Amino acid sequence: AKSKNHTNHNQNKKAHRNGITKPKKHIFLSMKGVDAKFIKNLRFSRKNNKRQ
Amino acid sequence: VKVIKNKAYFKRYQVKLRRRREGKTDYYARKRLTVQDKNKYNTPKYRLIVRITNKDVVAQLAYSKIEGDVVVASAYSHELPRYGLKVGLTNYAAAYATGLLLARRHLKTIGLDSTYKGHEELTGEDYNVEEEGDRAPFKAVLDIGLARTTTGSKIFAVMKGVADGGINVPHSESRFFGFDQESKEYNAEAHRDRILGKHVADYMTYLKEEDEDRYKRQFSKFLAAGLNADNLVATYQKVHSAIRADASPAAKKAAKPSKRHTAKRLTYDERKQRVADKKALLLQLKEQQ
Amino acid sequence: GRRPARCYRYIKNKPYPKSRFCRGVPDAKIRIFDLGNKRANVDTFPACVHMMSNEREHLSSEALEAARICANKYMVKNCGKDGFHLRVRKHPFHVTRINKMLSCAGADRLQTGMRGAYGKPQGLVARVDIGDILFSMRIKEGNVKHAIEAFRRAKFKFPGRQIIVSSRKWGFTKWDREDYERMRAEGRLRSDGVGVQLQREHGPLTKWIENPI
Amino acid sequence: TNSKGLRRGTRYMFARDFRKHGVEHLSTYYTQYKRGDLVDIKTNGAFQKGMPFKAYHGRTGRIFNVTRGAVGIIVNKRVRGNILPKRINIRIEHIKPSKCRTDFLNRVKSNDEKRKAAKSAGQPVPALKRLPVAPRGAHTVTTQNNEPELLAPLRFEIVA
RNA sequence: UUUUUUUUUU
RNA sequence: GCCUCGAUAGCUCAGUUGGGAGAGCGUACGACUGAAGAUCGUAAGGUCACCAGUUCGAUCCUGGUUCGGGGCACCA
RNA sequence: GCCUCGAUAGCUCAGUUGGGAGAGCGUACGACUGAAGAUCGUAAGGUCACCAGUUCGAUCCUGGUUCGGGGCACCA
RNA sequence: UCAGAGAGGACGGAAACCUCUCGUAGAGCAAAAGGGCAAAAGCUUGCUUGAUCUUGACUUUCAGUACGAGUACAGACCGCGAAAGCGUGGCCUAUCGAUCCUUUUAAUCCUGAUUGUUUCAGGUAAGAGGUGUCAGAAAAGUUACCACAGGGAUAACUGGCUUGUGGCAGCCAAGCGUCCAUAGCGACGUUGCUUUUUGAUCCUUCGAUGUCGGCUCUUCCUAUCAUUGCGAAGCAGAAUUCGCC
RNA sequence: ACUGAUUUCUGCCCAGUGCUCUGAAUGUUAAAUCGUAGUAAUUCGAGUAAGCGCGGGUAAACGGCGGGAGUAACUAUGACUC
RNA sequence: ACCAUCUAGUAGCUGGUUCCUUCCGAAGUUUCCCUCAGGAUAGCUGGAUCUCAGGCAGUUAUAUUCGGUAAAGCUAAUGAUUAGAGGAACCUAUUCUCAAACUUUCAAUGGAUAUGAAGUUGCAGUUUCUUUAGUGAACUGUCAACGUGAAUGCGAGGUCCAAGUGGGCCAUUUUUGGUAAGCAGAACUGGCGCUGUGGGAUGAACCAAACGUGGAGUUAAGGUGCCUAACUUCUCGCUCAUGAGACCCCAUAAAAGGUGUUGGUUGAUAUUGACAGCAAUCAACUAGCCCUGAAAAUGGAUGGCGCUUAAGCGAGAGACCUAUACUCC
RNA sequence: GCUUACGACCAUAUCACGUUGAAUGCACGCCAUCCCGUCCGAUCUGGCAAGUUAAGCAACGUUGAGUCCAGUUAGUACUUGGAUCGGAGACGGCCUGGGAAUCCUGGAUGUUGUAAGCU
């Protein structure tokens, strides 16, 4: 009664049934994971620019 | 014996980089000396090349680009005749003068000499260019090449010259002349004397006392130029003053016409004709022997 | 006894050469691959006959040796030991495997079934393709008949179909007889024992003078 | 089942090219990388720090971070029915600028320049669209000194 | 304290 | 029957890529002794079970014949 | 078939992490004895089973090979 | 600058140590294998403790959880270097551990609720003590006296596929057969057939297909022992051998 | 408890496991008790019985009871030896 | 032991689980579990809808890249491995045959990214970051101008709640173990499971084609002597078998033979008359059909009957028949 | 036409042998008081300029080895998709598109940047 039986048979069909969803377009806007020193200077730069 | 350098050897052989085969560039140190942090982007990182040949001292300022280094300033010890000195263009004093010349020349070029005069009184004490006003002093990192970093070596004499001229060269006094490696004490007086060439004058007096013939052999052209052991220090001080007075590069000359002095590569037809002639000559020799 | 050849006839597995991973391999039955007047000069034997294969199978070392013995015996008996040169152009390098099972009554008590069924070395076989040359014989032009009959007798020791042909090439060289004669006249082909070496033009002229071509 | 070490199966992927081992040339370090640029990933075996995972070898990514000697890259990776924009910190030695984006930027520059020139000079607006190669047009072929050569199938010859 | 043997016929 | 193993001098045993047939007992002679026994030395003992083959070359390697010796051989 | 264990003078057995190859009997020599045996004094002796590797050096440590020995081999 | 090679030098030899040439790495890098590396990642040597303190982000496995391992930064204090620089363990890919409990280190910390002091106890943060069945119960047998829920997901008998093994039949001829390959055989090789052997498998049957042999009784197949009709012999005949219908 | 009429016999082993016999035995041992420190909880130390460990007995208690080489005047075998 | 009660004891296991239509419609795979007849987890699926009205795609093009498999190589390294030659080993140049854990070289299929308004040019400000430095990097502005930049197709996106499943099996191609297996294990895709329909006599998977309920027409695969709707239709050959042969999977056949017959290849001789006997012939090959090789058990299978200038084998031609398919109503 | 310093690509640049080398320069070179480092001023370090292109280095030469490029190999090997395609099978061709690599043959033998200088 062997019961390991790995396979990848019906997996691409399942993956494609609802389409392969590509990543969104706003993912490049976030400044997450960027250098802390650069981020600090960006905060300082943004906190001081006069509006008018 | 089995031939080591056979067809397979040459087929599998990989040559080193040209400047490594020529034994001129140490790429391990070059990578750490010329590569700029990627968060500084294209901002040039300036390097002070010091190279002493058998008869000349070369000091240059450069920064690296993807197609070759860009030399921005250069001072050669063979330019010192313009400022007095005619002989001894390789000793400690000449090296220091060349460094000073480079520093003053480039500072004048970029219009910072007035702001940064550097240390204008030779005392031998360690000096670092303190920031004045808003513009920080020009900065360069020393590049000694394949030379050995020993105490009192002339590469650090050139570095000292540049630093006193007023360029920020990150350094410590450990490898300057007069620094006792044992007690970690620095003798500014000894360093000043070496910069002024007192060691050369001392050698002149010592040889004069010991043997006149050896003295003439050693310092033949010094005497021919009239530099004895009682005006050399004054000559070096005058050289320093002249450099600090004027440092602009010498004017260029006109392009003299040039002619071919070497042999030109043979053409394909010429090579084939030589092959035919050699074949005929060899056949004739075979038949006549 | 040996398993019938039909059990290892066709090429089914990847090549399994004897190496640091396949140890304890018994020796191949066939050892001699050049027979007859093997030291004859290149010009001695100008005619060449090949035995090509028409099957993509395994030729066993036993079959190779049997065919060698048959062809050698016939050729020696009908032409003399110095009238021919026979070369076997196939060496047995592939290792076949066997998963030995006990064949007596009550064997199932100890039998492991298919559990851990990886086999152990059994013998050496030569992987052969369509158009591959199995045997070659270089002989004089007045012995092609004997060579062909020898290969005809030998083909009955191999499984499947074999085709005997004659070659336009000079002996064991790679030059068709006409061009071989012409080039040898021009001195572009220097004897190399059984075969010949082409003497390309390029090189130092000091070497060229030793044989102007 | 296979082991799951980082460098399983990379025997040739992470190896140097034939007669290309040794010192890494410095243009690799002189190249300029800015956030938003596209880079190809190709692991250099000679550098074991900041190595990309084998899954990202040969992929293109967009830089989102620029540190002292490395860059953060957003690389698409397919996981079942979604594509994940993974973020990886790769050193400069394993990176190379991608020419696909630069070609497009050059084409955009050319388009803008052509439009500006036409508008300034009063010419009609030009066509600035790539078009698939159309079928060949009509033409005449001359046989002068090019007479047709009659071909026939060749007989079978026994090439022993 | 220990101290076994000595071919056949003559 | 099958897996095998072995066959060497009157008897018992070694031996080899395969490139010589050795040792012992036994037999004949000599030495020794008054004469023997024992002991020594010499001479010695062979188609390498038989046949065919492979090898430049087989006692040894492959196949077959004979002779034997050890094991294996429904079933529920 | 599986799991172990061992291989060392001519025979039977020790031996060290890895830097020694030992013990008894056997063999050879001298002595005591009329002679042998016992006895006394000496000597020489092993394929460390075969290989490859590991470290400075391996009989020993590791792996494989050859031989031998032991245990298991059960339902129905 | 290695491995190695060549040529030299008292004792010195194939091998001790010295010298010169050549030497693309054929060496070494703790270990398996694979990558990588030559003014180094190897060898020699100086100084050292970045194998330290802190939080986030990310990669690998992946559910895009956790551990482990790793990557690139940021803040601190440091080491080496003249400096640029490099350093958060080992050149890279394995070398390891939850909850509860115990224990240690940390704050001039919080709590013990009748008010306080001191012990004592409990907390917050970071480590260690270990689960190798390694996402982590605390664990010896026998049953033929046996029981229950099921299983043809799974063995023992039949049947099925296969045919290694068993059995049977061919092809070439090296030899045997006094001579003579084929009367009769036929080695070394090689092609097949059969399911009366034994294996392999696990397809059907475990809410049951009565599981050896013999006795009895039918029918069938021939791969023919006898008998009918024949052909061939190493067929002069009891006899015998081969083959055919 | 084992054996199992009569007859004739009942060999060797107390290492193992049991059972049993002595105990001077500070070897190991609980509670209680005693002493030290402390303002007290409490801490530390000393004692500390039987057992166990040491010693003896016992198999008609459970049980157990070997290998390898050489060797006799034909061979064979091996009384004999290592 | 028996009697009553706790007790409707627990069961990851077996059995059952009751009306009709309509619409949508799976999985046998990942990870963890004393886990392997079970769960949780992700995936696949349904429902509710909500926000909007061009950016997407199991497809191409352009541009740029990744790889070390097939082939190739060993007269290129490593490892095998035959034979000589030129100066017993050794050196030199060669040579025969090779590698899942060898490689200089290296495809086809394949993978990835980009292809404009979320853009391009400037102007004019911020920064404690960076630089010797407006030097850069980045950001900000109701800043100004420009105006959609490959093909084809097409509306797009978001959230929540939850079922069943977590035994698979088959086939072309690739592929590991095994002598093989209707055996065991994998990769891509398509199927059966869940699925009928025409054909293959019959059959889960084969070929065609997917389905409301009817009709007319036309077909796919398959066929047209009779079973049986559709021709003993038309043309040229080959084949005689004392049970020939007869249509994917597919329902077995080989090595080896034939002076049966039909075509071809090569080499010869022949009219200065070729072979046989006292006007073409000879020899060796080759490949179509036929024949031998070809033995099994209840009586039996091109599906059956039968068929022989076929109703067999091969190349073809007209027409014709027939689906739940296509067109139209 | 050159030399030097620093390079970029990293053999079309390497390797072997040989010829030539104006001027700058590079180099070899002389000395070892001093700094500095060694068993050793050989290397490294320092002070110099008598001498030499001998070597390094540069240019050139060679039917040179290697490397690089191209042709051929060849529409070959291999391969995507199709067939109620041929064949007992192994396999083979056809339709539809992609499409190599050795041997062999021919050619090339560094290009170029910044700075300074010679001519």
Ligand SMILES: C[C@@H]1C[C@@H]([C@H](O)CC2CC(=O)NC(=O)C2)C(=O)[C@@H](C)C1
């Ligand atoms: C750290 C390790 C484990 C720990 C302890 O046994 C584990 C616990 C775990 C749990 O949740 N309940 C328990 O009853 C046991 C302990 O004292 C030692 C064995 C060492």
